[PDB]
Design a protein around this nucleic acid. Structure first.
Ligand SMILES: [Zn+2]
Lengths: 75, 177, 98, 100, 42, 49, 38, 161
RNA sequence: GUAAAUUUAACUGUUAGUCCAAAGAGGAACAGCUCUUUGGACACUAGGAAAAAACCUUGUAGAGAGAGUAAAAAAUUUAACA
């Protein structure tokens, strides 16, 4: 179980990591499924582009926004 | 408060005399509220290194109420140090011999186990009855509310409340009762 | 004179007597001293809060170990408020003049 | 007539919100003690020929009774009233730093 | 130029209180005629 | 900050206590309802994007 | 009085009674049927 | 005259806490505007004295007022004497009025400015580790950089409405 | 998915181990008992089980008078009777 954690890049705790939903990767997850929290990655704005790399932010809900404005909603 | 430096310091670190009525009250709940006042835990300026404790006056310590069978089951044990000097008395036996021992022991067991515990016991005053010396009575400030609300006896209910409460059953007329 | 009180730099004698004169200039009736808070009066560590009342209106409240000391300090509190040298006053403006 | 806390002892707290809801306004004017809740200060406290000259009343008391009298008037224990040795009296900082 | 020694507090203010430093009577309501608990007047 | 406010700013701390008490009462009212009633005035949350 | 963990009546005259915190078996006809809960 | 959900008054019939009725939101909404306008009217006329502001700086919340000192345990890369503005203010309070940010106040409502007056290293701190019977003993001395800021002024603007 | 592995060169040092979980032996379906196997911890830090090498939480190292969390507080009152 320790080796699989290193292979998945989960050394530091409470550090989100993005992996592909494929059977080979899922095979490793099913071994350490009791040591990790699995959430889907949602894209309300879609895949980040080249111009949106510097404005990404992964919220706690699992959604990755491409426009992190740090500004209260006017609505 | 635009006070001078010395009067401002004196007022903040002043001692306030509080009053407690122990009639029909559990000793522990009396001790819990007396513990914080004696240690000064009720003040935002509280600190262990600062002697910020206050004076607690508890009256009617003879008429305390023990929940359950604590009058018969609870045992206060002490040892005189000599062989065969192990004495064990119940709460009822101790209460008759000393009306203020039960409250004093409950409060003493709640203070921190340090050298300051004996200092805080000097600022605690116990009186078995409602009689209080004038000097202690003339410097009281606030009467802390009783923790436990005394239930009313059946004879203390007025006719308005008795008639307000509905009867749930109709007894037969031929029942001797 | 930042962390210094008004009377800490201006040493005076009998602040109560000077308070009466400043109220006469403003057509204010003589203040009445009454006890608002009291604790440990019979003990060696008392606390008195003497409150100055003009026309049954509180103008200052001061603490003290004894009644005379508390009354004397309460007079200083009233003088600070009248002169505007309270601790609540806005700090000195050191910004560049406009 | 709703009030989260009784406006009787400390101040009259009036909660409010801004139009955008990005700032909470708290208007808390100080309350004054009513004139009817105070007590007046106790201002009040023969054929004599010889003037009453001040007479010293410092009665000699042993170390025991002196500490017992002090422990009762200040409601403390006898332990703090005993002196300490030179070693502890020399470790004490006679010029401590002062703040405010 | 001050000595490089331990500093007791990371802050220093000459007027720490603006609404009045806390005193035990700050949060205690006043009673009619300021009577003490279980005290009878006249 | 709250410890400093409770000592040097008693009036400000009472305002925070009133706000916390008001918010505490709003949650109890919302817990009694089934969501039909609108949320409390102080229960609104400013969203950041 | 014989201490028994389980109290059993030994005749029709034995009757159970709750006294002083423990059940007792009394039998006036047969005084040897008296038992005390252990 | 008893409803199907009626319970006679007993000890546990009703909750021990007294019932609390919240104000009508429609009626209370305009009541808030009256309080805000009064407090906003206290700012244009300058009916306030010293102001204490709670600012978030160096991952720390400081209860600062005017003309006071604060020690910061890191270097700001700023020459001494430079005047800067502390952007994050969470609370501004006065003798009679208090404003709360959610969680921060707008830059158009409060302005706090400080000055770099002294940049110095900390006093030597002893970092020593020891384990018995293992010949494990090593001593390290560190001097973390420090910075002292003095709050010059705390001013607000009438932008509540 | 990851970044190690093998070979080459040069030698030192450790191997009188413990306890916990699990499978199975010897003893008495005893032992802080003995003897193998798998795994963990311990001889590496800290928090929690009262004090605590072996249980649980948790590791990569500094300063802070900031913050969010992990494990983490024993329950129970029992006999009538045709
Ligand atoms: Zn029988």
């Amino acid at each position: 179980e320790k080796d699989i954690i290193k292979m998945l890049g989960l050394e530091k705790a409470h550090t989100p990591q993005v992996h592909k939903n494929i059977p080979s990767v899922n095979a490793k997850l099913k071994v350490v499924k009791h040591l990790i929290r699995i959430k889907p990655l949602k894209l309300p704005q879609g895949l980040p582009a080249e111009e949106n790399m510097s404005n990404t932010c992964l919220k706690s809900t699992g959604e990755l926004v491409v426009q992190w404005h740090l500004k209260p909603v006017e609505q | 408060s635009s006070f001078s430096r010395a009067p401002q310091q004196w007022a903040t670190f002043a001692r306030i005399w509080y009053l407690l009525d122990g009639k029909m009250q559990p000793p522990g709940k009396l001790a819990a509220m007396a513990s914080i006042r004696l240690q000064g835990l009720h003040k935002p300026v509280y600190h262990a290194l600062s002697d910020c404790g206050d004076h607690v006056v508890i009256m009617n310590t003879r008429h305390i109420a023990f929940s359950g069978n604590k009058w018969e089951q609870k045992v206060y044990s002490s040892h005189t140090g000599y062989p065969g000097g192990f004495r064990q008395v119940t709460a009822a036996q101790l209460h008759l011999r000393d009306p203020v021992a039960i409250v004093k022991l409950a409060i003493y067991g709640m203070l921190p186990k340090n050298l300051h515990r004996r200092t805080m016991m000097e600022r605690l005053h116990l009186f078995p009855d409602e009689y209080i010396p004038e000097d202690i009575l003339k410097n009281l400030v606030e009467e802390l509310p009783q923790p436990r609300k005394i239930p009313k006896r059946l004879d203390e209910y007025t006719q308005e409340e008795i008639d307000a409460f509905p009867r749930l059953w109709t007894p037969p007329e031929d029942y001797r009762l | 004179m930042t962390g210094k009180e008004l009377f800490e730099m201006w040493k005076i004698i009998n602040p109560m007597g000077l308070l009466v004169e400043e109220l006469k200039k403003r057509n204010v009736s003589a203040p009445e001293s009454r006890l608002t808070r009291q604790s440990g009066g019979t003990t060696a560590l008392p606390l008195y809060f003497v409150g100055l009342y003009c026309d049954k209106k509180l103008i200052a409240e001061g603490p003290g170990e004894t009644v005379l000391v508390a009354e004397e300090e309460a007079a200083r509190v009233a003088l600070r408020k009248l002169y505007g040298f309270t601790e609540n006053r806005r700090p000195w403006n050191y910004s560049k003049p406009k | 007539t709703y009030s989260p806390l009784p406006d009787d002892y400390n101040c009259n707290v009036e909660l409010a919100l801004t139009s955008d809801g990005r700032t909470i306004v708290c208007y808390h004017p100080s309350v004054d003690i009513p004139y009817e809740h105070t007590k007046p200060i106790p201002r009040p406290d023969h054929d004599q020929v010889l003037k009453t000259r001040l007479e010293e009343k410092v009665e000699h008391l042993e170390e025991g009774p002196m500490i017992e009298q002090l422990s009762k008037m200040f409601f403390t224990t006898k332990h703090r009233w005993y002196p300490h040795g030179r070693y502890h009296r020399c470790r004490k900082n006679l010029n401590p730093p002062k703040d405010r | 130029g001050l000595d490089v020694i331990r500093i007791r507090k990371p802050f220093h203010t000459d007027n720490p209180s603006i609404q009045g430093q806390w005193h035990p009577f700050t949060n205690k309501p006043t009673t009619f005629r300021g009577l003490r608990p279980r005290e009878v007047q006249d | 900050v709250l410890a400093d406010l409770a000592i040097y700013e008693p009036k400000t701390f009472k305002s925070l206590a009133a706000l916390a008490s008001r918010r505490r009462h709003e949650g109890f009212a919302a817990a009694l309802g089934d969501g039909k009633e609108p949320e409390g005035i102080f229960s609104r949350v400013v969203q950041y994007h | 009085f014989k201490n028994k963990t389980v109290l059993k009546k030994r005749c029709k005259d034995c009757y159970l009674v709750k006294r002083r915190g423990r059940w007792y078996v009394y039998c006036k006809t047969h005084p040897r049927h008296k038992q005390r809960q252990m | 005259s008893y409803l199907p959900g009626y319970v006679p008054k007993t000890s546990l019939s009703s909750p021990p806490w007294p019932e609390v009725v919240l104000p009508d939101p429609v009626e209370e909404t305009r009541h808030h505007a009256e309080v805000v306008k009064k407090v906003n009217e206290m700012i244009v006329t300058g009916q306030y004295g010293r102001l204490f502001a709670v600012v978030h700086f160096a991952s720390r919340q400081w209860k600062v007022t005017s003309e006071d000192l604060i020690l910061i345990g890191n270097e700001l890369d700023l020459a001494c004497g430079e005047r800067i503005r502390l952007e994050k203010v969470l609370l501004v309070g006065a003798d009679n009025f208090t404003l709360l940010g959610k969680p921060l106040l707008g830059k158009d409502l409060v302005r706090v400015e400080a000055t770099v007056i002294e940049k110095t290293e900390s006093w030597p701190r002893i970092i020593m580790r020891f384990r018995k019977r293992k010949n494990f003993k090593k001593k390290r001395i560190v001097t973390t950089p420090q910075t002292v800021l003095r709050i010059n002024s705390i001013e607000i603007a009438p932008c509540l409405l």
